Amino acid sequence: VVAAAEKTKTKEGVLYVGSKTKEGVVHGVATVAEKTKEQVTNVGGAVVTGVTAVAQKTVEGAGSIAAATGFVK
Amino acid sequence: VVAAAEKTKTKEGVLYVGSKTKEGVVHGVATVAEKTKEQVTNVGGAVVTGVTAVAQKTVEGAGSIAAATGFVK
Amino acid sequence: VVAAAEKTKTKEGVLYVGSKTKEGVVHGVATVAEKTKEQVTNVGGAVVTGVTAVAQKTVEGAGSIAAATGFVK
Amino acid sequence: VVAAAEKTKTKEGVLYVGSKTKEGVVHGVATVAEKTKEQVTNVGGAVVTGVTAVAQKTVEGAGSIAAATGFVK
Amino acid sequence: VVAAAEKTKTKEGVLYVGSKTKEGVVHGVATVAEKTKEQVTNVGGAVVTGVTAVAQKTVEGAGSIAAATGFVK
């Protein structure tokens, strides 16, 4: 499991957000197990969670994610 | 499982968002197991979750995701 | 499972969003198992989930996703 | 499990956010186990969770995440 | 499990946030186990959790996260 990233090197990249929420419940990244034997989970990269969510320009530079997720029996 | 990313190198990339929500529930990335034996899960890359979700220009630079997900018995 | 991405190098890329929702429930990426033996899942790339969802210019740069998902018995 | 990142080297990168929420519950990254035997979880990269969440320009420089998640029996 | 990061080398990178919340509960990163045998968890990288969360320019320099998470029996 190898990840390699290389980077070699007027409004730009500007965000305005206004949010109004009377009630918010946000769970993000969740793993829940109840009465479970084996649970293998991988979350990688960018997760944005919101009642309002904005992602801008998330990976302008090279980004690499490598995941091996699992079990051997 | 190998990921490689390489990058070699007027309004641009501008977002305006206004959101109003009286109630919001957002779950993002969730794995739930109830009475489960084996559960293998991989989430990779960018997940944006919102009552309002905006993704702009997510990977201008080279992005790589590699996933191997599973079990061997 | 190999992914390689290479990048070599007036309004442009501008988004305006207004959203009003009295109630929102959003689930994003979810895996649920109930009374399940084996569940192998992979989510890759960009997922945008919203009561309002906008994706703009998601991968201007080269993007690669490679997935192997499964089991060997 | 190896990750390598290399970086070699008018409003730019500016965000305005206004948020008003009467009530907020946010869970971030959560792993919950109840009556569970084995639970292996990995969260990698950037997670932004909010009643309002903004991510801007998250990885301008090269970013690498490598994960191996799992069990061998 | 090896991570290597190398870096070699008008408003820029400016954020304004105003937030008003009458009530906030935020959980950040949480692992909870109740009546559980084995629970292995890894959280890596940047997690921002908020009733309002903003992440700007999180990794301009090269960032690497490597995780091996799991058990061998």
Side-chain angles (χ1 to χ4, degrees), chain C residues 2-72:
Chain C
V2 184
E6 292 65 73
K7 218 230 172 173
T8 301
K9 211 286 208 163
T10 165
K11 302 190 199 183
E12 146 163 62
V14 177
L15 70 78
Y16 304 62
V17 170
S19 147
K20 195 190 171 274
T21 168
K22 211 185 86 39
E23 271 186 18
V25 179
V26 192
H27 287 278
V29 172
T31 301
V32 182
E34 199 204 318
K35 281 134 145 163
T36 305
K37 211 186 277 260
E38 298 113 329
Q39 205 187 22
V40 180
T41 278
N42 182 87
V43 173
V47 178
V48 188
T49 308
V51 176
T52 309
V54 161
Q56 186 186 63
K57 288 150 100 53
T58 308
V59 167
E60 309 210 71
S64 48
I65 326 188
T69 315
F71 67 90
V72 192

Side-chain angles (χ1 to χ4, degrees), chain D residues 2-4 6 14-15 17-18 21 23 25-26 28 35 37 39 41-42 44-45 52 55-56 58 62-63 65 69-70:
Chain D
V2 183
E6 292 65 73
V14 177
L15 70 78
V17 170
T21 168
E23 271 186 18
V25 179
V26 192
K35 281 134 145 163
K37 211 186 277 260
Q39 206 187 21
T41 278
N42 182 87
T52 309
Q56 186 186 63
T58 308
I65 326 188
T69 315

